[PDB]
Every structure is written in C-alpha cells, then in structure tokens.
Design a protein around this ligand. Structure first.
Ligand SMILES: Nc1ncnc2c1ncn2[C@@H]1O[C@H](COP(=O)(O)OP(=O)(O)OP(=O)(O)O)[C@@H](O)[C@H]1O
Ligand SMILES: Nc1ncnc2c1ncn2[C@@H]1O[C@H](COP(=O)(O)OP(=O)(O)O)[C@@H](O)[C@H]1O
Ligand SMILES: Nc1ncnc2c1ncn2[C@@H]1O[C@H](COP(=O)(O)OP(=O)(O)O)[C@@H](O)[C@H]1O
Ligand SMILES: [Zn+2]
Lengths: 379, 120, 370, 370
C-alpha cells in the first residue's frame, strides 16, 4: 500500500499533503486563475449549477495533485476532510470529480470535528471550528458526533473581513501621493479581499474582556461622555504601491468585537459553546466542559483563546447558564499542530491506519455500481 | 484490533454456523491524553501602547509557506527548501500510451514520442 | 471448583463457589450507541456491557435484557454471560460447572432456553437452576421461615418449613425496584426536575438508593413534609446541577406498601407476605411469623423492617410475636446462599450433566429444578 | 360574576384567545415576545422594546424573537405576563380581566410549580373573578362530541397521547414526549443548511417554521422517495429570493415518527399512541383503537393520517379496526372544547373563586383541577 493523500477544501484556504506527517505539505488560497478573469474565481461556491462547480473542482484538484503534490491520482487513496452539514450537491460533486475524472481508488468523507479530536488523543471533547464562512461547534463524546446538539453562527473570517471594510470606509485616511498628504476619504469604492485579510492578520488583535466590554458600551454611547479606553497607535498600510492607508487605532480592537458582541439575541462565538453544552445529555456535561478544542484560522488571531475562555466564564455567571453550567471547570486543549492545521493532522493520523481506511472508505467499484455516497441524511 | 474483530465477524457470517462454539473464544499500548490548561497565556501588554512595524510582522502568504510552525515575527521565519517541479505524461481513456518525455528532461526540449493535433 | 451466577434483573452477581462475597458485581445492561450516518471515531465497541456501559451512559441507549425476571432478548443476555465468564470472572465456562438463579413462578420457556444456551453456546459441564428465595435462607443459617425477596425485576414470597417448601403458598408480585424507579421519575417531573432518557433513568436509580427511606406513618410524614423543610435533602447530579427532592424522598418507597399509587390494583409487600403465610398450614404459621426474612436490594431501604413489622403485626393475631430478619448483606443474600449450596458435597449429585441433557433434552430441567 | 368567561389556550407556538360564546377563537396570534435585534440607544428606532403578535409580524426582520414557553413549560414568567396582558389589550378582546372569569389549557404531566405560578399571576397581577386549569386532551373530546377517545395532541412544544374511555381518563396510561413541531422546525433548519441555505437568526427561524408549514409532505415509504429524484419545489421568501428545498422537504417531519435518526432518545408519534392504548386495560384496547382523535397543529402535515394508520397497524394486533378521526379544525380543536365546557352550567361549580384561593391555600387550584 501507498501513503494516502489528505485534502481539506475550504472557502479561504485548502490544506494538502500525505498521511503520517507532522503537518500539511502545501496550504494555499482556494482559487484558480482562469484566462480572461482579472480576479481568480473561488473553487468552493455553494448554490450554483453542478457543471460550473465540476469544472472549477476539476481545475483545482489538478493543481493540488501535480504543482503542489507530485504523485499519480489513480495509484493511492484519498482522505477528504469536510465539515459536518457541508451542502449535499457540493460533496456529491467533489466525490464525482475524484471517482470519474481522476479515477481515485477510494475517498473517505471524514467530519473535521471528529478528526480534530484524534490529534489530542482524548476520546471525548467539545470542538469549536471558527472558519471563514460560519463558526460551527459540535460535541464529540467517545467517537460519536452528537448532531442533536449542533450550533453555528456567521461570525467567522467573511463576517470579520466585511466588518473591517465598513469601518475603514467610515474613517478613511489615505495618502495617494497626488496632494493627498491631507486625509482623503473613499478614493477607491471597494477594497480587495486580499488586502483586508493582510490588514486583519498584521494590524488587528483581540482585546481583553475588561477592555472589550468598555469598547462595546463606548461605541454604543449609552448615556455616557467619552467612556472608551486609550487605543493603540495608528498603523500606516501601503495600498497598490503609492497609496498609503492610515489605519485608526480604534478600528484594530473594535473590528473583532462583532464576534463577542451580544447584540440582544445573546448569540456570540463565546455563547455558542454554552448554548450547545446546555442542550447536551446530563451525563456528558462535565466531561465535554473539561475537554474544549478550538480549531480554525479565525481563532489564530492574537489573544482570541484568552478572550473566549474569559467571555465563557463571564457568560456562565449570567442567570440563563447559571443554573445548569454554574459550577463547571472549563479547560482548553493545546493541539500539537497550529490552530489552522488541526483538522488536516487528524486525517493524516487516520490515513496512516491503512487497515481501517480501506474498510470505512467508499471504493470506486461501489460508486460506479450504485452512484450513492453515504451521508448522515436517510438512505 | 478492529480489523481482527471485523475479520472474525465477517468469516463467521461467511461460514453461517450461527456462532457455533467449536473452540474456546477470547501486551497493551496506552497513550496518556493531553493535559488541559486551566488558563491559556493572555495577550502580552506590549501590544497595547507600542508602534507596529509592518516590516517586522510577516504577511499571510509568507506565513503559510512555512505551515509546520507559521511564525508571526520575521526573525523566527526560516528559509524553506525549493519546491521540485513535475514532468507530465498524457494517457487517454480508449487509447493506451499517447505522448511522454525523456529521462533527462532537465536542459532538453526533445519528446520521446512527439504527438500533437498541429502535427497531424 | 464451581461458579455461582445470579441473573438479577437490576444487577448480575457472579463469583466462585465457597468465596464469602461475589467477585464481580456489575449492572445487567447492554449499551448500543445513538449512531447517525456520520462515521464513528476509534476504539469503538459495537455493543457495550455493564460497568463499561455504566461509564458511557451519555450516548448509549440502556436496554435491560431481563424484564420482571423474564429474559425478553436472549441475544442480549448471551452478551452479558460472555462479559460475566470471559472478561469479569476471567474463567473458561467449559472447565467449571455453572449454577444460575431464576425467580419462582416464571414462564417455563425461561428455564428451558436459559439451560439450552449454557449447554450448547458456552458448553458447560453441568447446569442447575435454583429459586432465588430457597438460596436466601442459607445466608442467615435458617432452614425454617418465610422470605420476602424483593428484587429490581420482581418480588416473591416463598414459605419453607424445616427444609420443605410449600409451592402453592408461593405468591409473585410484578411491583419491584424498576417500577419504583419509574414512579420516582414521574413525581420528580411533578416537582420540576424532568428525567426522560434511559441514561437519565439510571441517575434517578442512584438518587433512589441514597436518599429514599420508608416512613412508619405515611400520613404523619406528609404532615411534617408540608410544615417543615427538615426531610428535604440535596443531591448533586453527574452535572454540577443540584436538586432538592423534598417529600418525594419517602413517597417513592410507599408504593411497595400500597401499589394503588403505581395503579396496579394489587396487595402490598406487607399484605402479600401475610396472605402467603395464611395460605400455608395452620400449625407452621407460628415459625413463619417468627422467621420472616427480607432479601434482595429492594429491602435495603432505611427503616423498611420497622414499617414491615408494624403492618404484619396489625394484620396478624395479637398473641403472635412477629420478628423481621434483616442481615447486613441483603443485596448479596441470593449469591451468598448459592456459594453455601454449591460448596456442600450433597449438592454434587443434584447437578444436571451434559450426558443427562443430551439424551433427555432441555425438558429435563423441569424435573430437576426444585 | 355571570359575564361571559374568557377561554385562553396556552399553546407553546400559538396562544388562542376569545369568549366562550364564539364558535371559533376570534383572536389567535403567535406566542413570542419581539424586541429590537440591535440594542437601541438612539431615537428613530423601534420604541417600547415590546412587539407582540401582529405588530411583531409586520416588523419581523428588524426584531429578535424569544419564545417564553418551551416544551409546555414557562421558562421566562415576566415575558408570559406581557403576552397575557396583550390578550387583554385594545388590539385583541378589548375588555377588563377583573370582570370576566378565565379558563387555562396546560399540557398533561406539567410541573406543579408551573400551575401554581400560572394561578398566582392570574389572581394577583390580573384581578380575575375565578380560574380553572384543565388538560388539553380532555377539551379535544368535547369539541368532537364523543365521551370515549384517545387524543394524540401534537402541539408545537409537546406531543402527548391521553386515553379517555366513557368520561374516565387513566392517569398512568398518559404518554408525554418533548419531540414536537418546534423540534421538527429545528431539524428542518439543519437539513436546509445541508441543502446550503443558512437561517442563523432568531427572526430567520420563523421563516423555517413558515417553510415547514407551507411545504413538507410525509411519504408512506421514506426509502422509496429518497431513491426517486425530487422535483425541487421552489419556495418564495419575504425578501423575494427563491429556495429549492428538494429532499429536506419530506425527510424533516419523518423525525416525528423516527426520532433516533437525528439522535434523540424518544418513542415516536406512532409508538406513543399504540403504547398509551397497550398500557390501558385489555377490555378497552379495541374501543380505544376504534376511537383515536388527532389534535394540535403538528398533525396537519400532508399525509400524516396516511402514515400514522400504516405505522400503527403493524405495531397494533392483526384484524383490529383502527379509526383515526381527525376533525377539519385540528389547530383550533383544543379551544372549541374549552368554549363548549365554559358555556355549560357545570363549569360554574368546577372553577376556583378568588376568595377561595385566599382562604383555602395553594392546593385549591391543584385539587379542583380534576
Ligand atoms: N441501598 C438501597 N436502597 C434502596 N434501594 C436500593 C438499594 N440498593 C439497591 N436498590 C434498588 O433495588 C435494586 C436491588 O437489585 P439487586 O442488586 O438486589 O439485584 P436484583 O436484580 O434485584 O437481584 P435479585 O432479584 O436476585 O435480588 C436495585 O436495582 C435498586 O433499584
Ligand atoms: N495564521 C493565521 N493567522 C491569522 N488569521 C488566519 C491565519 N490563517 C488563517 N486566518 C484567517 O482565518 C481564516 C481561516 O479559514 P480556514 O479555516 O482556513 O477556512 P475554512 O473554514 O473554509 O476551512 C482565513 O480566512 C483567514 O482570514
Ligand atoms: N397547516 C400546518 N401544516 C403543518 N404544520 C402546521 C400547520 N399549522 C401549524 N403547524 C405546526 O403546528 C404548530 C401549531 O401548534 P398548535 O396546534 O398551536 O399547538 P397547541 O395545541 O399547543 O396550541 C405550528 O407552530 C407549526 O409548527
Ligand atoms: Zn484515442
């Protein structure tokens, strides 16, 4: 047998490499540069025609299997990591591309949350997945994902990128280099997603709960006269060479707060753990609480894990969660690989198990015969 | 253990003896599970009231090229080995062979079997 | 060298003959997971059993294989016996002969199919089925006297005088520990604390065992429960959440003494014990009043013996002296009897062999049962 | 006071109000409190911080929906007081609560604290002449006009099966499971995300309930419809955008009849009906199968009666007549029953007067319930 390849198709970035390795070999933006198109189209797009999606995935998988990885597709197996409740037609297409065009031996559709649990070694743990599109949580108890007690909110990368763009356009101060030393607002109508992502990573950080709670009430201005903490210094960011955008200190520590803002509904990234944990079985409560896992690149943002764990323990004392989750000890697990590449590492650890892989995985001979991929929906 | 269990279960179904007890039925490796920290390290108080040089911190593109330990600072970021390129050979569905390349494709523009639509 | 294996509906007590207490005591349950179409993680057992299923209650649907001392699912019971011999006891069933326990006045198919498995599946050298009540007397070193062996599955009253049992005087009542556990859920749901799932029912059994106690005067206890909050005790769940059960503490075990609460329309555990003695011969009644034994874990309720004495004394004549026999080890009263029986050299002859089973069939058990 | 009594159904999803004289409930509005989604500091926004029923439906996308009652139990009492205050508003009824007496319809086997607090509010906050808490099941029979009948009342919050024979309800044969219409709405949202349409917001949960109510058919065989390629019927949203539901349409409400699929440990809607009949005495079983009544909104699913009949038949004994008599007004059946009950002169005796509650104590409401 040969070392099975692991792919993990995401909206922002795709993880790729081989099984039984310390981390992924290639990690790249999930896009393709088609002739005529100035900006490259995104390879994973939900709610489009199958033929157009088929062509994009055919183009992308080709780049992964030749330019990034150097190996024959037909020779060795595949371990496709994809999140639970991934759209039906997308997963059906992705398999149909691998089985028909590339003619792979067998694909294994592992849920990202159960794979993240294997990397630690613990059999039972709560898993939060703060991705690009949606920040999803799914309790895993001793190998069994509990779909009953699922939770998701659109407070990921996309929702954060959009919030940054909005704030920058309000307090817009750019030095074009054409008598634009004076503050010039909205010279460009929209900012490209590639720039916004680079600003987010380098400039913006996650504030402490004490400082963050003041920032929330400050921008609200709820019958108070200038009750904001002192912001960090303003950082100057180059746009397309000559144009120098002066990023305000307030924007850096306020952009993140949309994730941890209550917004009346009581629906934050913090609340989603406690909302799910309260809905879980009464016996499983204390085991899941003690074993928390924080995957996804959105949680890589500096000082996110401290704010989350703090915001949890504050929301615990709130009267809604005070009865059930009152006297619970919330402890976070530190996975071996980085927060972005926890999902991938599980699939590699699973891919190394040649004996179990072949049995669980769906063979091409079965797919060609039936034409029915197994899912958590009815058969 | 699961393979042996699945094999034993499968050969029992294939036999179709209804689990007939002819003979008597029935070293361990134990990993310690990772310890959960009570409080994760907070964001350093330096980040508050300090000028951020965009030269010192690394962009996403150059962060992600070193995935095993993608470092925020530039001083940590080490140079990775150069990525090897591929020499493609085409094979059809109905037909067998089609075209291919030599064993010394480095500094060579020769095809072992030249085949193209413009050449027929 | 011989094995005693009590097949109780609540807990399966198994061990070696001659030993003081049973070696392995685990809850008699099979844990099948609430699996979706999503793939399962590693270290996955298709069906968990006993202490393993008791650890992994959260996800697994707990299904008791024996219902009212009748084996409903035999495939499940086979998996428990496989966990009993091979894993729990660490002994081959082919080597040692196995003594099992059946409740009195059970269906004939139960004893028939029980022994068939032991002889064919496990290939045991000898197999003897015994009445749980008959064994329970040996524990107290008493040949004479009636027993009120109330289990999780059933409660039965077997009067035995001078080492001779009265079969027609035997009375069976379906009211037992599991019905009380089911009753306790309903009245806890009336207070506020809702328990629905099979895993939650197991937590309600832990609440029952620890807090619940038998009241001497129920009407007097309800008056004190209403006025003062002295009887109200707190219990911590597996979750940090704590609950204050209140009057429902002593309301649960009352159902034993008056089944009207459960709504069975039957005689109480006190009244059935009296009725059984009255069905017996007039002469021997004296000793049965003097030697009334309480066996099983449904007679480990704090102050059942005091309430039992009071209720029997009222029904029984005034001149008679009513003594209730409550030994410290009531839970293991069925097994400890089995250990004494199996050890005795006389019992060596009473064993049913494979040769005897092969020639006659499984019907031989009905002749050599009791 | 002789003035006409006000019937009010405490439906988790939709509360139905009106006078006892009316043949149908004039005022029935959704049971949820509407507050502005964005925390309003500024002027020119939604004022009051309270939007109930038709006002909420108008400005739905702007507000944040919070249901005060979950699984037939009141979680937030402050919210429920505002809802009952809106029942006695200028919008609906337009009367004094102090003048007219009241009839509540609490689900069976609810917490006793739920009934006690419900009475306290209606006696203290509103100055009611008299109050009477009743079972939802018992009312449903008055509406149809038959004494005997099992009532499978599938509401939004709770689905319960109560067998009543010749005006006698067996309280032990009652069966209650939490998997109701609201859970079907929750599971449909999950399958809609599996089709690739997110409804993350609490306002966006309301349109999932509308999608369910509009287009969701129960297939007689679920396995055949899954293999068959769907039409993918388009539904139009409030904004104007179209969504192709496809296979999610039929495999969402299936979770009523088979709740193990998602991973919820419950019996199922076909099972609770049969179990409730089988739990009752053997003589009545035939008549209870011969008289089944569907109540509530979570029976109006297209081909519910067709599936239930088939699923009941295979579980029920062979060659037994099974008549599932659904009225045309299933959603409003529970209220019509109360409206008839309230009109009768016997109701005058049944309810508890305000002075009675002050003198007798707390028990007064509980003891007069039945
Ligand atoms: N200390 C206790 N106090 C009250 N109830 C108890 C106590 N211990 C156990 N119980 C209850 O009574 C039952 C006793 O079961 P036990 O361990 O005696 O096995 P069993 O299945 O009843 O066996 P057998 O029928 O042979 O006696 C338990 O299932 C539990 O519900
Ligand atoms: N190393 C990093 N540091 C900070 N932010 C990151 C880092 N890597 C990714 N991110 C951000 O978090 C997001 C993570 O998305 P990702 O989990 O890779 O995608 P998906 O959820 O589709 O699998 C990216 O879109 C990016 O904005
Ligand atoms: N026509 C319909 N088709 C399908 N489901 C419906 C229909 N009407 C109502 N429902 C469902 O039933 C619920 C109404 O329950 P309802 O009968 O008001 O309960 P209750 O008896 O507790 O008042 C709605 O919230 C919805 O989920
Ligand atoms: Zn060809």
């Amino acid at each position: 047998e040969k070392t099975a390849v692991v792919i993990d198709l995401g909206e922002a970035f795709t993880k790729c490499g081989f099984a039984g390795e310390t981390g992924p070999r290639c990690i790249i933006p999930s896009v393709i540069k088609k002739a005529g198109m100035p900006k490259p189209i995104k390879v994973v797009q939900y709610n489009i025609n199958t033929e157009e999606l088929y062509s994009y995935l055919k183009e992308f998988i080709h780049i992964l299997y030749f330019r990034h990885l150097l190996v024959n597709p037909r020779d060795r197996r595949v371990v496709v990591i994809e999140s639970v409740l991934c759209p039906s037609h997308f997963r059906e297409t992705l398999t149909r591309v691998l089985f028909k065009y590339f003619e792979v031996p067998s694909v294994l559709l592992a849920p990202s949350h159960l794979m993240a649990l294997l990397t630690l070694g613990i059999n039972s743990a709560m898993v939060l997945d703060c991705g690009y599109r949606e920040s999803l949580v799914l309790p895993i108890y001793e190998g069994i994902p509990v779909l009953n007690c699922w939770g998701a909110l659109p407070l990921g990368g996309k929702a954060l990128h959009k919030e940054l763009e909005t704030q920058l356009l309000e307090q817009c101060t750019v030095d074009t280099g054409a008598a634009k030393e004076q503050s010039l607002p909205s010279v460009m109508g929209s900012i490209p997603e590639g720039v916004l992502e680079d600003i987010k990573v380098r400039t913006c950080f996650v504030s402490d709960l004490t400082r963050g709670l003041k920032i929330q009430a400050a921008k609200f201005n709820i019958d108070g006269n200038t009750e904001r903490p002192s912001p960090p210094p303003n950082v100057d960011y180059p746009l397309d060479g000559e144009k120098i955008l002066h990023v305000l200190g307030s924007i850096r520590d306020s952009v993140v707060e949309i994730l941890f803002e209550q917004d009346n509904e009581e629906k934050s990234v913090a609340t989603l753990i406690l909302d799910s944990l309260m809905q879980c079985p009464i016996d499983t409560r204390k085991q899941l609480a003690e074993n928390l896992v924080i995957i996804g690149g959105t949680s890589m943002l500096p000082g996110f894990l401290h704010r989350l764990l703090a915001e949890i323990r504050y929301l615990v004392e709130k009267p809604k969660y005070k009865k059930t989750l009152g006297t619970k000890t919330f402890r976070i697990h530190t996975p071996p690989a980085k927060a972005n590449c926890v999902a991938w590492l599980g699939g590699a650890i699973f891919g190394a198990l040649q004996d179990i892989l072949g049995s669980r995985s769906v063979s091409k001979e079965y797919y060609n015969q039936t034409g029915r991929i197994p899912d958590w929906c009815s058969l | 253990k699961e393979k042996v269990e699945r094999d034993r279960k499968k050969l029992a179904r294939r036999r179709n003896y209804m689990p007939l007890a002819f003979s008597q039925h029935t070293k361990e490796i134990k990993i310690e599970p990772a310890q959960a920290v009570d409080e994760v390290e907070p964001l350093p108080e330096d980040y508050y009231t300090r000028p951020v040089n965009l030269t010192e911190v690394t962009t996403l593109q150059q962060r992600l090229l070193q995935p095993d330990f993608q470092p925020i600072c530039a001083s940590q970021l080490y140079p990775r080995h150069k990525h090897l390129l591929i020499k493609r050979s085409l094979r059809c569905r109905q037909c067998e062979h089609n075209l291919s390349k030599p064993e010394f494709n480095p500094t060579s523009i020769k095809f072992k079997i030249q085949l193209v639509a413009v050449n027929y | 060298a011989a094995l005693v294996v009590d097949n109780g509906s609540g807990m399966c007590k198994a061990g070696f003959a001659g030993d003081d207490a049973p070696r392995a005591v685990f809850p008699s349950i099979v844990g099948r997971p609430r699996h979706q179409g999503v793939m399962v993680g590693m270290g996955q057992k298709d069906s968990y059993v006993g202490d393993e299923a008791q650890s992994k209650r959260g996800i697994l649907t707990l299904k008791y294989p024996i219902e009212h001392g009748i084996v409903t699912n035999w495939d499940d019971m086979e998996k428990i016996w496989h966990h009993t011999f091979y894993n729990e006891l660490r002994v081959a069933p082919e080597e040692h002969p196995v003594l099992l326990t059946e409740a009195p006045l059970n269906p004939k198919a139960n004893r028939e199919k029980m022994t068939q498995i032991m002889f064919e599946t496990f290939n045991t050298p000898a197999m003897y089925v015994a009445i749980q009540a008959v064994l329970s007397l040996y524990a107290s070193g008493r040949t004479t006297g009636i027993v009120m062996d109330s289990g999780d599955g059933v409660t039965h009253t077997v009067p035995i005088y001078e080492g001779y049992a009265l079969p027609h005087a035997i009375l069976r009542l379906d009211l037992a520990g599991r019905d009380l556990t089911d009753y306790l859920m309903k009245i806890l749901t009336e207070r506020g604390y809702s328990f629905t799932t099979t895993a939650e029912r197991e937590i309600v059994r832990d609440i029952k065992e620890k807090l619940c106690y038998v009241a001497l005067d129920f009407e007097q206890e309800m008056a004190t429960a209403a006025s003062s909050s002295s009887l109200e005790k707190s219990y911590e769940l597996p979750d940090g959440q704590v609950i204050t059960i209140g009057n429902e503490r002593f309301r649960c075990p009352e159902a034993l003494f008056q089944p009207s609460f459960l709504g069975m329309e039957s005689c109480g555990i006190h009244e059935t014990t009296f009725n059984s003695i009255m069905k017996c011969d007039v002469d021997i009644r004296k000793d049965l009043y003097a030697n009334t034994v309480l066996s099983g874990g449904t007679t480990m309720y704090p102050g059942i013996a005091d309430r039992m004495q009071k209720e029997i004394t009222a029904l029984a004549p005034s001149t008679m002296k009513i003594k209730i026999i409550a030994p410290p080890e009531r839970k293991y009263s069925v097994w400890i009897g089995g250990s004494i029986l199996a050890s005795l050299s006389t019992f060596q002859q009473m064993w049913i062999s494979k040769q005897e089973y092969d020639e006659s069939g499984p019907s031989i058990v009905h002749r050599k049962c009791f | 006071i002789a003035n006409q009594p006000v019937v009010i159904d405490n439906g988790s999803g939709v509360i139905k109000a009106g006078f006892a004289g009316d043949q149908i409930p004039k005022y029935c509005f959704p049971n949820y409190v509407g507050r502005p989604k964005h925390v309003r500091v500024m002027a020119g926004a939604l004022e009051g911080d309270i939007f109930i029923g038709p006002k909420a439906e108008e400005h739905r996308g702007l507000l944040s929906i919070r249901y005060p009652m979950e699984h037939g139990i009141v979680k937030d009492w402050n919210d429920m007081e505002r809802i009952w205050q809106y029942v006695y508003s200028k919008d609906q009824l337009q009367t004094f609560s102090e003048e007219h007496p009241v009839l509540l319809t609490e689900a069976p086997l609810n917490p006793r604290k739920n009934r006690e607090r419900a009475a306290e509010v209606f006696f203290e906050t509103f100055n009611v002449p008299a109050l009477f808490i009743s079972m939802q099941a018992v009312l449903s029979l008055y509406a149809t006009g038959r004494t005997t009948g099992v009532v499978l009342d599938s509401g939004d919050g709770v689905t319960h099966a109560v067998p009543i024979y010749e005006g006698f309800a067996m309280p032990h044969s009652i069966m209650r499971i939490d998997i109701a219409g609201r859970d079907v709405s929750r599971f449909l949202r999950l399958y809609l995300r599996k089709e690739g349409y997110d409804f993350h917001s609490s306002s966006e949960f309301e349109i999932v309930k509308a999608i369910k109510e509009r287009a969701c058919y129960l297939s007689i065989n679920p396995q055949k419809d899954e293999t068959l390629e769907t039409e993918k019927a388009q539904y139009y949203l409030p904004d104007g955008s179209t969504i192709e539901i496809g296979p999610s349409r039929f495999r969402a409400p299936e979770l009523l009849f088979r709740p193990d699929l998602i991973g919820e440990e419950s019996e199922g809607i076909h099972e609770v009906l049969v179990f409730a009949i089988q739990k009752s005495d053997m003589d009545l079983r035939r008549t209870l199968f011969s008289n089944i009544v569907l109540s509530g909104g979570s029976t109006l699913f297209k081909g519910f009666g067709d599936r239930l009949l088939s699923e009941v038949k295979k579980l029920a004994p062979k060659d037994v007549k099974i008549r599932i008599s659904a009225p045309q007004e299933r959603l409003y059946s529970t209220w019509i029953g109360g409206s008839i009950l309230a009109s009768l002169d016997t109701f005058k005796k049944m309810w508890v007067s305000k002075k009675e509650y002050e003198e007798d104590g707390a028990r007064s409401i509980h003891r007069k319930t039945f």
